Enzyme design. Structure first.
Site, PDB file in Angstrom:
ATOM      1  N   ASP A   9       1.070  -0.982   0.271  1.00  0.00           N
ATOM      2  CA  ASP A   9      -0.105   0.239  -0.167  1.00  0.00           C
ATOM      3  C   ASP A   9       0.959   1.506  -0.164  1.00  0.00           C
ATOM      4  OD1 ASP A   9      -1.924  -1.945   0.008  1.00  0.00           O
ATOM      5  OD2 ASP A   9      -1.896  -1.018   2.151  1.00  0.00           O
ATOM      6  N   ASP A 130     -13.430 -11.894   1.078  1.00  0.00           N
ATOM      7  CA  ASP A 130     -13.085 -11.653   2.748  1.00  0.00           C
ATOM      8  C   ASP A 130     -14.606 -12.523   2.907  1.00  0.00           C
ATOM      9  OD1 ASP A 130     -11.343  -9.777   2.327  1.00  0.00           O
ATOM     10  OD2 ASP A 130     -12.964  -8.371   2.291  1.00  0.00           O
TER      11      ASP A 130
END
Ligand SMILES: [Cl-]
Ligand SMILES: [Cl-]
Length: 242
Positions: A9, A130
Site C-alpha cells: 500500500d 472476505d
C-alpha cells in the site's frame, strides 16, 4: 519463487511514493521504489499494489504509480481495483499491471470477472474474497468486511472459477470486518471447491503461522505489514515453500 505475494500500500507524500503499513495509516518512511526492488530480491512471487487515499483507505488504480513500479520489477503486478468498469481495468493493464484484484465490484457485478477474463486473459483476474462464519455458514462480506451479502462462500468460490478468475485471495475477517489471521478451517473448506491458486491473506507474521496455511490448502500467502517490519519473513517463506 511462487509462494509469496507481497501486498504494498502506497501513496505520494512529500513528493515521493511511500510505503504505508497498519491499514494505510503509518508512513513507514520507506520509498516504494526501494521496497519493490527489495521484495523481488527476497523471492516474492507477485506484488499486489494498492494506491491508498488521504486517510489510508483503498483508493482506485493509480496509473502513475503502476507506471512507476513497472520498470523496477519483472514480477506480476496485481493492481488492486477499488474500481467497477471495463475502461477502469484497461487503464491499469495499459499502465503496466498484469492482473487486477477485485472484490466488492465483482460480487455486485459478477460479469466483470467474465468480461476481464474474456478480454485480457485467464491469468488476468484475481478475486479477493472476505469471508467469516455467520449463522453457521461461511458467508461472503463486502464493503470492507461490513456487509453480509447473503452469498455462501462455497457458491461464490465455484462461480468465480467458472467466470475465469486466475487466483483467489482469501481473507478471514473478524467480528467487525477487519482482516483477521489465517482461518485454517476456512482454507480447508475452500480447497476442494477450486483448482485455482489460493492466496491466504495473513494478518500475522511468524513462520509456523505460514506453514499452517500451506498445510490447510493455501498455495501462497499474502503479507504486507509483517513483511515490512520483518523483511526476512519473505526470504524465509520463499526459501522453505517456493
Ligand atoms: Cl516520481
Ligand atoms: Cl461447514
Amino acid at each position: 519463487m511462487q509462494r509469496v505475494v507481497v501486498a504494498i500500500d502506497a501513496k505520494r507524500v512529500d513528493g515521493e511514493f511511500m510505503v504505508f503499513t497498519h491499514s494505510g495509516k503509518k508512513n513507514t518512511g520507506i520509498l516504494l521504489r526501494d521496497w519493490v526492488v527489495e521484495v523481488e530480491k527476497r523471492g516474492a512471487g507477485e506484488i499486489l499494489l494498492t494506491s491508498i487515499d488521504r486517510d489510508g483507505t483503498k483508493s482506485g488504480y493509480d496509473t502513475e504509480m503502476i507506471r512507476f513500479v513497472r520498470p523496477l520489477t519483472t514480477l506480476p503486478i496485481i493492481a488492486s481495483g477499488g474500481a467497477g468498469k471495463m475502461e477502469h481495468f484497461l487503464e491499469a493493464f495499459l499502465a503496466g499491471a498484469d492482473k487486477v484484484s477485485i472484490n466488492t465490484a465483482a460480487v455486485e457485478n459478477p460479469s466483470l470477472i467474465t468480461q476481464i477474463a474474456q478480454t485480457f486473459g485467464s491469468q488476468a483476474v484475481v478475486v479477493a474474497i472476505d469471508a467469516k462464519r455467520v449463522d453457521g455458514e461461511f458467508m461472503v462480506f463486502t464493503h470492507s468486511g461490513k456487509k453480509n451479502t447473503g452469498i455462501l462462500l462455497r457458491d461464490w468460490v465455484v462461480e468465480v472459477e467458472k467466470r475465469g478468475a486466475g487466483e483467489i485471495l482469501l481473507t478471514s475477517i473478524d467480528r467487525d470486518g477487519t482482516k483477521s489471521g489465517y482461518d485454517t478451517e476456512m482454507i480447508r473448506f475452500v480447497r476442494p471447491l477450486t483448482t485455482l491458486p489460493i492466496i491466504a491473506s495473513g494478518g500475522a507474521g511468524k513462520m509456523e503461522h505460514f506453514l499452517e496455511a500451506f498445510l490447510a490448502g493455501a498455495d501462497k500467502v499474502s503479507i504486507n505489514t509483517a513483511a515490512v517490519e520483518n523483511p526476512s519473513l519473505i526470504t524465509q517463506i520463499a526459501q522453505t515453500f517456493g
